[PDB]
């Protein structure tokens, strides 16, 4: 059970020069591990098969080194179709541990989320529930906060968030914490504010409404 530690946790790079990646082993694998291309929603694909040697139709730019504890994966000529979660994985020891995950993002600039809270529908009040949805939209990076305020009461646990993938077009993100409440706790209050703290935001943006306003 040799722990494989990938030294870049994630990476963001606007498409360009060498974007070399790293994975370390807990023991001496000695050039007996492989590199992988798990694309989002896809089957993984072999990049490097034994610490180098550029497996079977890999284009021009995906060398790597190692031998035998801390291994490298050189993304030299970035080619932005290659934005995928990458994986070192030892093989010549059982059981066969994978790496951690090497989500390669894009580094445009830090942008502000266009924050949009949404009341639950009256159809949801016909369902006897209430889910307040606070948008975040068209921003960078994912490093955000949502602090729900229920007549200005800092609440969580009733709220499930939702992270879009990074867009191919504008490299942005979109969040939605979903403050799912009962209808009874919904009727107890009106001021439903959503304190959103993001780096592109200068302030913790509190997007609010009143129960029955919109």
């Amino acid at each position: 059970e040799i722990v494989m530690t990938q030294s870049p946790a994630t990476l963001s790079l606007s498409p360009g020069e060498r974007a070399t990646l790293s994975c370390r082993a807990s023991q001496s694998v000695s050039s007996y591990l492989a590199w992988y291309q798990q694309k989002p929603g896809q089957a993984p694909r072999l990049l490097i098969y034994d610490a180098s040697n550029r497996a079977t139709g890999i284009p021009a730019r995906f060398s790597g080194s190692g031998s035998g504890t801390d291994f490298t994966l050189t993304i030299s000529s970035l080619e932005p179709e290659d934005f995928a979660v990458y994986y070192c994985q030892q093989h010549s020891l059982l059981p066969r541990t994978f790496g951690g995950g090497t989500k390669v993002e894009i580094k445009r600039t830090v942008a502000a989320p266009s924050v949009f809270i949404f009341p639950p529908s009256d159809e949801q009040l016909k369902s006897g529930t209430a889910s307040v949805v606070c948008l975040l939209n068209n921003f960078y990076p994912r490093e955000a906060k949502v602090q729900w305020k229920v007549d200005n009461a800092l609440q969580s646990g009733n709220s499930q968030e939702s992270v879009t993938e990074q867009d191919s077009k504008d490299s942005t993100y979109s969040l939605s914490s979903t403050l799912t409440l009962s209808k009874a706790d919904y009727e107890k209050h009106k001021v439903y504010a959503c304190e959103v703290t993001h780096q592109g935001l200068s302030s913790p943006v509190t997007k609010s409404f009143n129960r029955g306003e919109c």
Binding site: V29, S30, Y32, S65, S92, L94
Partner: protein, 317 residues
Amino acid sequence: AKSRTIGIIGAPFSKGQPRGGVEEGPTVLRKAGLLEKLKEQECDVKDYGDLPFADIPNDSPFQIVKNPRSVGKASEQLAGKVAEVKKNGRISLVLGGDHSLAIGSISGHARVHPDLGVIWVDAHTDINTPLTTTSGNLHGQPVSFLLKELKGKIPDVPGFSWVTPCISAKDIVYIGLRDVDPGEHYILKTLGIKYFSMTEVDRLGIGKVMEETLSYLLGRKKRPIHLSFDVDGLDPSFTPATGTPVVGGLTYREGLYITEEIYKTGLLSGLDIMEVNPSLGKTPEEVTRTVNTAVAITLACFGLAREGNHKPIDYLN
């Protein structure tokens, strides 16, 4: 004595086989304490440490043969060490590791004793060429470098230029064959190498097979004998933690009888114990049985008879 005068060579080596973990072959066997289990009886135990094997990162393969140069450097270092410890008049106990080490083992032994013979106990012949291989793994190709009859048939493998073919087709006896390639069986029938598959052992019995083996090798001329051993030739009921588990192997009793007859020759001059993988043990109990099996084989190589052994003095005192 002249027998059981031991130089111990550990080789934590794996690069001639795929499954890493036989590097902890000498580690486990030394922490199994083979030394102390020799030190009761009159054993001149002298370890020479483990060999520092360099890690060449640019070990560019052959067509099918992979990692030629680090393996060749390993066996060349080992050939120097084996020739060194056989200058000491000891018995070269080498243990790894895999069959690629046996190249340098037999090489350094032939540097001292060019008239040697090899008892290659193994499930396999391991006689593959770089051409006639299916895996390219050099633990499946040790013997072909060492045969004079395959001269020219051996391609110029990078890292094995120092290798001199030292034995003939009559100089080697296989015992335990039950996993033989068509290329291997063709070469075996080509050179007319004396062998003993599991068929002839089940026919004749292990006593008659060992009788015919010593009659073939030492009935002509008393010569130094280099037993090179694989643990998979014994049945994986006893040795499941081997690199190439093939069912239907020799029994533990049979292997002990083999090694006892080898000790009773007294012409044992070098021992090779390979394919010891503790990482292939599904339980630690598997590792325990396999290691104890290999240790008991080594002890019966160095005098531990099942009938009993004693220092030649009176005990009724």
